[PDB]
Amino acid sequence: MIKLSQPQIPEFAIEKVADILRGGQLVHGDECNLFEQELAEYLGVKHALVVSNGTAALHLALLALNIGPGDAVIVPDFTFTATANIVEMVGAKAIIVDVDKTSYNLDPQKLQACINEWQGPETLKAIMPVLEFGNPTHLNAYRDIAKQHGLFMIEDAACALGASEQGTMVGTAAEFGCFSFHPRATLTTGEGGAVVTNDTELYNKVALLRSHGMQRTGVVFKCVGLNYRLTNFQGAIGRAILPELNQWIAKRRELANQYRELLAPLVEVGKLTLPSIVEGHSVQTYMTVLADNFERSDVIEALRSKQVESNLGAQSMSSLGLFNHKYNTEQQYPEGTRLYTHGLALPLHEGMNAEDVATVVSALTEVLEH
């Protein structure tokens, strides 16, 4: 099977994990602390904190910003369900705004309209744009819009570590950036994530919330908190991969260019559309959109039988019945709905070569012919 991902953890990292298990510290230790330092340096951001997973990162960002009951946060229609779920979990309401069809990211015009029209009853406190599939498109616009309207911005950069727009590293534009180290995420720790910020007060708050409100001095419990700590052995894995991330992103960009060339016939005859792999895109996922006449579920099944793993890219929040703020049924979300219904992620990861891309395109061509 040509898979959506197939992370290769360096053997020296496996050996380090074994050493840690055999005779090292298991909870967050030197490996996690060094990983944080190295992540911060990589991003050019003041602070990083590693955490249990990318959902945990978003959760902690919301909590550190005192977003909760009585509040609202804008999310894109097209994203993984965690983005909207985690807003609701802290007691806030997820306010859905459509994405644009080119980038698959929160549409800045529709975002402006939502903010402009907002009059409560909840207090609109934040935007949570997703840099979907590694696409940084609109990063700086989101920052500008948040600043214009006095909103916090939490980047859901789950799939976008290493991406950048116009000199701004994704995750670093405003209050918080949140990353995932799920096995689809290029840098993986099995489960894992990170919260980054340039604001030391926010860093200190997240550090408390991550581990029971504990401040080292002996230990003082400063506030109520959670446990979202990453193990030291997970940290070891991640920091072993980080020095390779740029090379892996470069490889993914080359593979994407191969897809762009090989898929042009299918585009020209109208059977699908391509993602727009802009400068700074980290190519975490390569999602096409099939023409309406194809049943996407049947295409996935047929590709599986031809040893190609494919899937939808992400969900349409408005389609799920979970985010029932009044705003969310005042208009339709045609772009996110199209991407949810017709989107098709094709394998693209650093373990593939150009021949593997040709294999996938051959299989897809065959399936869409018959």
Ligand X SMILES: CC(=O)N[C@@H]1[C@@H](NC(C)=O)[C@@H](OP(=O)(O)OP(=O)(O)OC[C@H]2O[C@@H](n3ccc(=O)[nH]c3=O)[C@H](O)[C@@H]2O)OC[C@@H]1OCc1c(COP(=O)(O)O)cnc(C)c1O
- Asked if 244 touches a second copy (CB under 8 A), the answer is no
Q: Count CA within 13 A, CB hemisphere, residue 214.
A: 10
Binding part of the chain for a second copy, among 10-18, 148-156, 171-179, 347-355 by CB under 8 A, reads: 10-18
Using CA atoms, how far apart are residues 349 and 10, in angstroms rounded to an integer? 16
- Which residue from 168, 226, 306, 359 is in contact with a second copy, where contact means CB under 8 A? 226
Q: Which does 18 bind (CB under 5 to 8 A by kind): a second copy, ligand X, none?
A: a second copy
Question: Which of positions 128-167 make contact with a second copy (CB under 8 A)?
Answer: none
> Containing H/E element for 11?
helix 11-23
- Asked if 81 touches a second copy (CB under 8 A), the answer is yes
DSSP state of 215: E
Binding part of the chain for a second copy, among 142-150, 263-271, 314-322, 342-350 by CB under 8 A, reads: 314-322
- Which residue from 1, 34, 223, 250 is in contact with a second copy, where contact means CB under 8 A? 223
Is the CB of 33 or the CB of 123 nearer to ligand X?
A: 33
Residues that bind ligand X (CB under 6 A): 3-6, 25-27, 53-55, 79-80, 82-83, 130, 133, 156, 158-159, 180, 182-184, 193, 227, 285, 309, 311-312, 314
Binding part of the chain for a second copy, among 100-108, 169-177, 229-237, 351-359 by CB under 8 A, reads: 229-237
Using CA atoms, how far apart are residues 209 and 191, in angstroms rounded to an integer? 19
Residue nearest to ligand X (CB): 54
Question: Quick one: 183 exposed, middle or buried, by C-beta within 10 A (0-12, 13-18, 19+)?
Answer: middle
* 246, 161 Cβ separation under 8 angstroms: no
DSSP class per residue in 60-93: HHHHHTT--TTEEEEEESEE-HHHHHHHHHTT-E
Binding part of the chain for a second copy, among 3-11, 95-103, 111-119, 196-204 by CB under 8 A, reads: 3-11
Residues 6+ apart with CB under 8 A from 116: none
Q: Which does 158 bind (CB under 5 to 8 A by kind): a second copy, ligand X, none?
A: ligand X
Is the CB of 130 or the CB of 145 nearer to ligand X?
A: 130
Is the CB of 280 or the CB of 343 nearer to ligand X?
A: 343
Using CA atoms, how far apart are residues 106 and 96, in angstroms rounded to an integer? 9
The three-class DSSP label of residue 334 is: helix
* 86, 317 Cβ separation under 8 angstroms: no
Is the CB of 274 or the CB of 320 nearer to a second copy?
A: 320
Is the CB of 44 or the CB of 213 nearer to a second copy?
A: 213
| Residues facing 193 on adjacent strands | 51, 180
Q: Which does 59 bind (CB under 5 to 8 A by kind): a second copy, ligand X, none?
A: a second copy
